[PDB]
Structure 1
């Protein structure tokens, strides 16, 4: 007998500003690190970039009416820092704030709760130019000025806020794998920039307590719960290293203000541990979040990895199935295909029960409420004549994840809401446009913007029914 979804459960959907807005040089917006990176040749699928994206900046009113028709209870979006401070830390672009004001007003006038994400990967280029952005401590105060600017302008209308969205991705993709800006492949610099982001996070949570005393705020972590391949003790041990190094490394800082010891000692043994200043631990420990945000797509299965063993593996940005290979850290763990789950064409595992597992781990380890800030399925959609999109594959994935969330709630996990990724189809950072996630199909591809028309997919009407019945009908 399942607990019901609670009465104020934030049934939501989400986007990120670069992926959706366009208008990259309008109304005073400065360059982000992503405006600049995606235009370097070879960085992105087919040269795709966010110049136009799906033009949500101009078309937000249409998108909001669609949200209202779906009956959305919450919409999570991010603010483009480079629209508010074109040079990152100088004078404010009022026109940039005015767009988010019009957006928020449009949401409120249809009864939709705004969830504001402060940072979704788009630090202004001028901060990268002046001091290397997340690699310098200067960013702590610059990010704080920006956050407080938002808090003051919108704090009376926005109760739910997300600080850093998937810090583990933007930091590791940016500084270890070289796949995101600034395109660095240097572990030492990765862990230093990570430490600085931890500080910036805590700093803004602290300012939030002053400026938005009734709000709720948290970071959002990209969480792939680890599993051991089997009961072989070395594989279990690899599991312990993987969960600690990939997951606790961030979440313990967010929840407890502390890095876990074994991962710290491994880094220290390699000269990789971050530089710690007087006052750092005190800041990090005094900034407890109201919730842990969680972005969940899949779990990861691991096995023993000897010290001469696997390092970086092949990622899959095409969509040919079976092309991904093992990744790891030599001597600690490496990934392996989980034989007991399907995968998408991009090799992401489909593991709804894993969401239950990850939610149960976070409650068990931190006792924190959880806002699920992203979850969804990306696939090719076919637009059929008569503006029809039958995305049963997406419904099937959403249905099963939302069911497991109900199981977690029944187990006692305090889940505040669920934001499907994404509302409209949007631009993939690297993969272009054909890997779609939306409830609302957007008519464009990697080569032409077409008319950018919005077309409700079958999943739209499915989620609309989920919301109308508060989850009883899936």
Structure 2
């Protein structure tokens, strides 16, 4: 006997501004770091970039009408900081705020709850030029000025807010792997920037309690729960290391305002622990979120990694299955294929039980409500004549994950909502357009924008039925 989904459960779908909007230089928008980075040769697949994307900026009315036809309860999107502050911290661009105002008005006139993400990786280039963006404490008050601008303009109409989207990804990809802007490969700088971003998160949650006292706010963590390979004691110790180093390192700061000690000590032994200023711990501890945002796609299984062992691994960027290789931290852990689950063509594990495990771990450790801000299947889709897209593979992935959400609710996890990634097809940051996540197919590829026409996939009508039945019929 499963509990039903609660009556106001937020059945949602999501996007991110750079991936969807286009209009990269219109109506006074400034350069973001992704505008510049994606135009550097070799940074993105086939040189794809966000100049046009799927042109949601001009076509948002059509898109919102499709959300209404689906019956979406909530739509999660991000605000492009460079539309609001073209130089990051000077005068406000009213035309930029006016777009999100038009968008929010369209959502509310169709009965859709907006979920506003403050930051989805697109800090204005001018802040990078001025002081190195997230690597400088100057960004704390600059991010706060931007957040409060949005809180005052939209707080009357937006109850749910997300601060930093996947801080662990944009910080580690931007400063450890050099795959995202600023393209840096330096663990010391990575953890310095990470600490500053923690302070920025805490500062804007504090501001939120003043400006939107009736709202709900949280960060959105990119959560891959760790498994040990087996019961070998060295592999369980690897799992202890991996879950602390990869997940607690962020979620403990979010929930408790404290870094975990074993990870901190290991970083200290390497001269990598961040610089802490007077007042830092007090700010971080006093910034309790209303929920933990969870972006979930897969679990990760780990095993013992000797001190001379695996470091950076090969990432599957192409869609050719079986090409990923182990990555880890020498002396602590390394990843290994989970032999008890299947994987997508990009070698991502398909593990819906893992979502129940992840939701259970967050409840058990932090006692926080969870808003699932991203979950989805990225796959090639074929457009069949008749504008038909039979994505049963996507339906099956979403179905099994939503099922495990309900088992987690029945366990007692307070889950506020579920945002499928993504509503329409959109630009992937590094992999172009072919790896599609949408309920709504967008007619374009890596070579041509074609006509960008929207085509409802089979999963569109499946999710429409899920929402109509509040998830009783999956």
TM-score range relative to shorter protein: over 0.9
2:120 match: 120
Partner Cα separation in structure 2 for residue 261 and residue 361 of structure 1: 19
Structure 1 SS opposite 2:379: coil
Indicate the RMSD between aligned Cα atoms, in angstroms.
0.1
Give 1:358 deviation, angstroms: 0.2
Partner Cα separation in structure 1 for residue 451 and residue 129 of structure 2: 36
Give 1:14 deviation, angstroms: 0.1
| 1:124-151 residue CA offsets vs partner (Å, 9 max, x unmatched) | 0000000000000000000000000000
Partner Cα separation in structure 2 for residue 175 and residue 268 of structure 1: 18
Give 1:208 deviation, angstroms: 0.1
Partner Cα separation in structure 2 for residue 321 and residue 448 of structure 1: 26
Give 1:329 deviation, angstroms: 0.1
Give 1:472 deviation, angstroms: 0.1
- Give 4+ residue runs of structure 1 displaced > 3 Å after superposition: none
TM-score, normalising length: structure 2: 1.00
Gaps of at least 5 residues in structure 1 are: none
Partner Cα separation in structure 1 for residue 458 and residue 273 of structure 2: 49
| 1:436-459 residue CA offsets vs partner (Å, 9 max, x unmatched) | 000000000000000000000000
Structure 2 SS opposite 1:199: helix
Partner Cα separation in structure 1 for residue 337 and residue 319 of structure 2: 17
| 1:310-341 residue CA offsets vs partner (Å, 9 max, x unmatched) | 00000001000000000000000000000000
Partner Cα separation in structure 1 for residue 317 and residue 62 of structure 2: 31
1:354 match: 354
Gaps of at least 5 residues in structure 2 are: none
| 1:223-262 residue CA offsets vs partner (Å, 9 max, x unmatched) | 0000000000000000000000000000000000000000
Structure 1 SS opposite 2:293: strand
Partner Cα separation in structure 2 for residue 219 and residue 380 of structure 1: 30
Structure 2 SS opposite 1:281: helix
| 1:12-39 residue CA offsets vs partner (Å, 9 max, x unmatched) | 0000000000000000000000000000
Give 1:420 deviation, angstroms: 0.1
| 1:250-289 residue CA offsets vs partner (Å, 9 max, x unmatched) | 0000000000000000000000000000000000000000
Give 1:434 deviation, angstroms: 0.1
1:316 match: 316
2:147 match: 147
Give 1:219 deviation, angstroms: 0.2
Partner Cα separation in structure 2 for residue 433 and residue 369 of structure 1: 34
Give 1:119 deviation, angstroms: 0.2
Partner Cα separation in structure 1 for residue 364 and residue 93 of structure 2: 44
| 1:136-188 residue CA offsets vs partner (Å, 9 max, x unmatched) | 00000000000000000000000000000000000000000000000000000
Give 1:43 deviation, angstroms: 0.2
Partner Cα separation in structure 1 for residue 53 and residue 243 of structure 2: 35
Partner Cα separation in structure 2 for residue 271 and residue 283 of structure 1: 24
Partner Cα separation in structure 1 for residue 180 and residue 377 of structure 2: 22
Partner Cα separation in structure 2 for residue 177 and residue 343 of structure 1: 23
Structure 2 SS opposite 1:13: strand
1:24 paired with 2:20, answer no
Alignment of 1:383-462 (within 5 A): 383-462=383-462
Partner Cα separation in structure 1 for residue 287 and residue 379 of structure 2: 38
Give 1:53 deviation, angstroms: 0.0
Partner Cα separation in structure 1 for residue 317 and residue 30 of structure 2: 29
Partner Cα separation in structure 2 for residue 287 and residue 86 of structure 1: 28
Structure 2 SS opposite 1:218: strand
Partner Cα separation in structure 2 for residue 97 and residue 233 of structure 1: 55
Give 1:117 deviation, angstroms: 0.1
| 1:389-412 residue CA offsets vs partner (Å, 9 max, x unmatched) | 000000000000000000000000
